[PDB]
């Protein structure tokens, strides 16, 4: 199905390559091989640019868990 | 106010000191200064132990953002 992310906070663009967005906006991630800045496309504003990946979460639950942090506790 | 986290996924205990929980449980964090495993207390099961911090989210929205990922886009 169409897989999107939702913004957890507002972000104000400050460069010519980042993307502003509002809390609750739905974003399509067009690229995530760049590190912790992801190339996103807004479903509601039609703008495109880089976003901080820690400002968004997946739009749907039922995702599978991430790897556990290592080391494990005792 | 009472600050809690919510489980995003089930977690099955596998060590001597970790804590099992179910998706949707609310957890009170009693120590989060030791690394990415946090000492938690279940509101519903009354159990206590270490949880993987990437399996939980804050219960409340409207917390403040994390600092912007390190390097930048220009
Ligand atoms: Zn799909
Ligand atoms: Zn409070």
Author numbering:
A (entry chain B), B (entry chain A): 85 to 158
Manuscript text:
ChoKα is upregulated in many tumor types, including breast, lung, colorectal, and prostate cancers. Given the previous observation that c-Src is essential for the interaction of the EGFR with ChoKα5, we speculated that this proline-rich region of ChoKα may represent a docking site for c-Src via its SH3 domain. Co-precipitation assays and surface plasmon resonance studies offer strong evidence that ChoKα interacts with c-Src through its SH3 domain, and that other domains of Src may enhance this interaction.
Each fusion protein was expressed and purified, and the His-SUMO tag was cleaved to yield pure protein. Though SH3 domains function as monomers in solution, the SH3-ChoKα(60–69) fusion protein crystallized as a dimer. The ChoKα-derived peptide of protomer A bound to the c-Src SH3 domain of protomer B and vice versa. Notably, peptide residues corresponding to ChoKα Pro61 and Pro62 make direct contacts with the c-Src-SH3 domain, with their backbone carbonyl groups interacting with the side chains of Asn 138 and Tyr139. Finally, added stability for the peptide is likely a result of the C-terminal carboxy group, which interacts with both Thr99 and Thr101 on SH3. Our crystal structure shows that Arg103 of protomer A from an adjacent unit cell helps stabilize the protomer B/peptide A interaction by forming a salt bridge with the carbonyl backbone of Leu67.
